[PDB]
Amino acid sequence: GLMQFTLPVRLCKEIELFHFDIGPFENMWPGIFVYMVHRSCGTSCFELEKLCRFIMSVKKNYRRVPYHNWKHAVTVAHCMYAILQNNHTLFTDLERKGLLIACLCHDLDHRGFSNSYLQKFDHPLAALYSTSTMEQHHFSQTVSILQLEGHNIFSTLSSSEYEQVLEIIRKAIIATDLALYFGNRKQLEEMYQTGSLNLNNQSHRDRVIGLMMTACDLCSVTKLWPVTKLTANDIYAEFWAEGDEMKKLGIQPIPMMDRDKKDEVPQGQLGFYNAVAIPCYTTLTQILPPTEPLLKACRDNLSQWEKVIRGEE
Ligand SMILES: CN(C)C(=O)c1cnn(C)c1C(=O)Nc1ccc2[nH]c(-c3ccccc3)nc2c1
Ligand SMILES: [Mg+2]
Ligand SMILES: [Zn+2]
């Protein structure tokens, strides 16, 4: 069992940094992911034949949308890998397994619409799950692909460990609901400043993993400015498609989703960096100090968005 994956030199070095971009070659993303599972969890923790079959069924169940696509899934797995590798000792053998899989599956079958739009359209999924609609769907699709023949990457786990690792994956995928992030971060802020944060409290690990999930999900804000700029074009392309569908239901969309308010984009990024991103990576860096580079990179991009407003680009 001696089939170590390697990456060309620049990838082998740059993949270890939080600000790595996985590049434009779709057919290398699976090798990238396996390399991260091997270095992150051990070469022994998964059966390579089963893993590759799981990766490729997951890829097939991501859709051709401008942002919530397979490249996003792998980008979010890579950020999580950076966190695990710079916090080597804080995490169980199971959590390392669960959380990289969680990140790969966190947006399975996304069609580029918010929970809000499923509610107003009255989508069947909104009937089946009243909150975290898409996120309960993503988790449901994860379980499906696990129950296909030759796809149980967790076969060699006990019935017990199997149930623990699906529970890490479930809570991990739910926490990508940004509506939950606000309360989750408020509570973590208070536990850390009134000294009560304790990582043997399973109630507290859950919350911390939930914040890592927001961190990894938002990580386009933690890249070099030209990656951040170009990912924003993709995010808005989904946002403006959804607003078009809003107007089709007879509903004025929020400005975020109004392509007619393109002009205010930079001002709207400030809002988002100030209200969501900066507070996110702040609180995370307090709980897990080696994640500081995510904060630093977020501040730089916030500064780059200030430059756009002031006509200096
Ligand atoms: C759900 N989701 C994926 C994200 O929020 C996300 C993830 N990464 N990034 C970078 C974002 C993001 O850009 N969010 C965001 C939030 C409020 C906004 N208001 C606006 C805006 C307001 C007025 C006029 C024009 C525009 N633009 C906005 C963009
Ligand atoms: Mg999502
Ligand atoms: Zn996502």
Helix/strand layout:
Layout (H helix, E strand, L loop, with lengths): L8 H6 L14 H13 L6 H14 L8 H17 L6 H13 L9 H7 L2 H5 L4 H14 L12 H16 L3 H16 L8 H16 L7 H25 L15 H23 L4 H18 L4
Helix pairs in contact: 2-4, 3-8, 4-5, 4-11, 5-9, 8-9, 9-11, 10-11, 10-13, 11-13, 13-14
Subcellular location: Cytoplasm, Cytosol
Subunit structure: Homodimer.
Family: Belongs to the cyclic nucleotide phosphodiesterase family.
Structure description:
Helix 5 crosses helix 9. The chain is globular and about 55 Å long. It is 65% helix and 0% strand. It has a single domain (28-310), classed as 3'5'-cyclic nucleotide phosphodiesterase, catalytic domain (Catalytic domain of cyclic nucleotide phosphodiesterase 4b2b, Orthogonal Bundle), CATH 1.10.1300.10. The chain has helices at 9-14, 29-41, 48-61, 70-86, 93-105, 115-121, 124-128, 133-146, 159-174, 178-193, 202-217, 225-249, 265-287, 292-309. It is mainly α. The protein contains 14 helices and no strands. Zinc ion (ZN) is lined by residues 68, 72, 76, 106-107, 176, 217. It is classed as hydrolase/hydrolase inhibitor. Keywords: phosphodiesterase, PDE10, hydrolase, schizophrenia, HYDROLASE-HYDROLASE inhibitor complex. It forms a monomeric assembly.
CATH class placement = Mainly Alpha
CATH T-level topology: Catalytic domain of cyclic nucleotide phosphodiesterase 4b2b
Order of helices and strands: HHHHHHHHHHHHHH
Strand content: under 5%
Bin the helical content: 55-70%
Quaternary state of this entry equals monomer
Q: Give a count of the beta strands, DSSP E runs of length 2 or more.
A: 0
User: Bound compounds, please?
Assistant: the ligand CN(C)C(=O)c1cnn(C)c1C(=O)Nc1ccc2[nH]c(-c3ccccc3)nc2c1, magnesium ion, zinc ion
**Shape verdict:** globular
Q: How far apart, in Å, are the first and last alpha carbons?
A: 53 Å
Give the domain tally. Answer: 1
Number of separate helices: 14
Going by CATH, what is the homologous superfamily?
A: 3'5'-cyclic nucleotide phosphodiesterase, catalytic domain
Radius of gyration, CA atoms, in whole angstroms? 19 Å
Structural class: mainly alpha
Binding site for a divalent metal cation 2: 107
Protein name: cAMP and cAMP-inhibited cGMP 3',5'-cyclic phosphodiesterase 10A
Subcellular location: Cytoplasm, Cytosol
Binding site for 3',5'-cyclic GMP: 68, 269
